[PDB]
Design a protein around this ligand. Structure first.
Ligand SMILES: Nc1ncnc2c1ncn2[C@@H]1O[C@H](COP(=O)(O)OP(=O)(O)O)[C@@H](O)[C@H]1O
Lengths: 44, 114, 373
């Protein structure tokens, strides 16, 4: 939910998937985290 | 016009140069014809003097003393860009260092039109 | 050399994906989207709005399975976006901005399908370059010959196209809406006669597994009816997920026979052998004897045991007797299209044919008709 708060798009991601130990979804979660976490005023 | 305004206690020379070109006497007012002369000299087509070419390749280079081919290739046909790259030399800055991509329009304009 | 391209095959049934220059695809998974239908009572288990692909197959008991691609046409674009996102991020773990993608689709399709596919692959995933190809041409790449008629049967549509010496005749392309999903529905219909009833979308996958495991193409239809009527040697036993045991028997060779006689489904169209023969006769005179010797089977639907002998016998019966008919079915014909994609994706001379991002920006989504095919 914190990741969804940052508007990082996760697809086919669920809590039971992470708890159950699915390899592909865990690796995808890590991959997504890696990609997404690294006057003149008067004149205008 | 690309004129930043109302800096905190700072003076810029673009507005001063525009005011000098419009009203050199510092009269504080610009008439209908005073701004129209600037608009006509700024708008299009025929050219009176080479000084506007002088300080307009400076504005095309965004005030930089050197210009690049990529900057010239958003405004000018690659035919003319190839001509300019063939006939205009490499730029030397005030420090003396030479860029591989530094191109001086000042020397070229003073060589052909001067 | 630089960065390798992506090869993605989107058939109607299952999606396949991998890197160009590879022998086999990395990711193979069904193209389904599932959503729950019952009440949820356990507080704190977390929520999940959709189940995509293989994850929907394991938890299929409490879901309503939906297919985004129907008869080779993308009906629901949102589920296609979900499938593509799952393929790119969870299955291959690659950023789509670094790789070009090559896609596959049917010969005769609506124009809006290709236009929307190009718009989706440029606008959202921001791929630098992309290309669309016909699946059966990629099958002819996979075979490795310059001349032949290729018949591809998937889960959505069957199509035949002849190619001679690198030139494809457009008027001889035949498309038939008889595929594996229709055979699955017919198996669901004829399994009622013995007392087994499957209705919901969960049991459709069970029927598909039954069809993939215990079905075969009869060489002679009436003789097999006589044999199955005389004895009980043709019966086979299957075990349901809940533990019950079913026994098919007669229906093993009646489901795949419906490809050759579409009147069982009520369709007026001809069989696949007659479709291939008619597509051959639509060509010119001089190339017909070359097309008789280079018939290529492709797609998963042609993985029934005994399809090659039946096809060869039927086409031999229809053709004049003075020429020889040989049917070339590679053992790995399920993935042939994808293999062809790899062979196309990393040719040296193909690198000038990608649809550039700048070209899409200056042309709109209509650039895909001028290029591609
Ligand atoms: N081993 C098999 N034997 C018989 N039929 C099969 C087999 N494997 C797949 N099929 C049929 O082919 C369909 C899948 O074909 P596929 O090649 O995935 O089509 P596409 O990739 O064009 O969607 C399945 O629905 C099933 O009906």
């Amino acid at each position: 939910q914190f990741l969804k708060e940052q508007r990082v798009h996760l697809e086919n991601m669920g809590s039971h998937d992470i708890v159950d130990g699915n390899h592909r979804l865990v690796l995808g979660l890590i991959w997504t985290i890696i990609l997404r976490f690294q006057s003149a005023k008067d004149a205008l | 016009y690309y004129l930043p305004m109302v800096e905190e206690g700072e003076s810029e020379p673009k507005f001063e140069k525009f005011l000098d070109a419009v009203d050199p006497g510092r009269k504080g007012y610009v008439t209908q014809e005073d701004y129209t002369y600037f608009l006509i000299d700024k708008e299009s087509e025929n050219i009176k003097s080479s000084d506007e070419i002088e300080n307009s390749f400076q504005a095309l280079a965004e005030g930089k003393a050197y210009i690049t081919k990529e900057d010239m290739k958003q405004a000018l046909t690659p035919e003319q860009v190839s001509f300019c790259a063939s006939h205009m030399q490499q730029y030397v800055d005030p420090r003396g260092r030479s860029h591989p991509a530094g191109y001086d329009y000042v020397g070229f304009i003073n060589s052909y039109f001067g | 050399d630089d960065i390798a391209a992506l090869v993605v095959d989107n058939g109607s049934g299952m999606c396949k994906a991998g890197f160009a220059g590879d022998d086999a695809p990395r990711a193979v998974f069904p193209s389904i989207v599932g959503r729950p239908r019952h009440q949820g009572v356990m507080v704190g288990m977390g929520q999940k709005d959709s189940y995509v692909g293989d994850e929907a197959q394991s938890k299929r008991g409490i879901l309503t399975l939906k297919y985004p691609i129907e008869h080779g046409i993308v009906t629901n674009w949102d589920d296609m976006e979900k499938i593509w996102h799952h393929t790119f991020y969870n299955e291959l773990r690659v950023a789509p901005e670094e790789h070009p993608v090559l896609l596959t689709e049917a010969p005769l399709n609506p124009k809006a399908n290709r236009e929307k596919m190009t718009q989706i692959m440029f606008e959202t995933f921001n791929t630098p370059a992309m290309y669309v190809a016909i699946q059966a041409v990629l099958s002819l790449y996979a075979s490795g010959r310059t001349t032949g008629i290729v018949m591809d049967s998937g889960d959505g549509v069957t199509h035949t196209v002849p190619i001679y010496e690198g030139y494809a005749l457009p008027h001889a392309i035949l498309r038939l809406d008889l595929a594996g999903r229709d055979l699955t529905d017919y198996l669901m219909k004829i399994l009622t006669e013995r007392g087994y009833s499957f209705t919901t979308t969960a049991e459709r996958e069970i029927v598909r597994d039954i069809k993939e495991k215990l079905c075969y193409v009869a060489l002679d239809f009436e003789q097999e009816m006589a044999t199955a009527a005389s004895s009980s040697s043709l019966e086979k036993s299957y075990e349901l997920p809940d533990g019950q045991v079913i026994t098919i028997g007669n229906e093993r060779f009646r489901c795949p026979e419906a490809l050759f006689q579409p009147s069982f489904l009520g369709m007026e169209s001809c069989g696949i052998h007659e479709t291939t023969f008619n597509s051959i006769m639509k060509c010119d005179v001089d190339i017909r004897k070359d097309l008789y010797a280079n018939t290529v089977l492709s797609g998963g639907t042609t993985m029934y045991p005994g399809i090659a002998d039946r096809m060869q016998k039927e086409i031999t019966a229809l053709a004049p007797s003075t020429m020889k008919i040989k049917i070339i079915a590679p053992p790995e014909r399920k993935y042939s299209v994808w293999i062809g994609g790899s062979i196309l994706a990393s040719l040296s001379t193909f690198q000038q044919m990608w649809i550039s991002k700048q070209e899409y920006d200056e042309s709109g989504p209509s650039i895909v008709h001028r290029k591609c095919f």
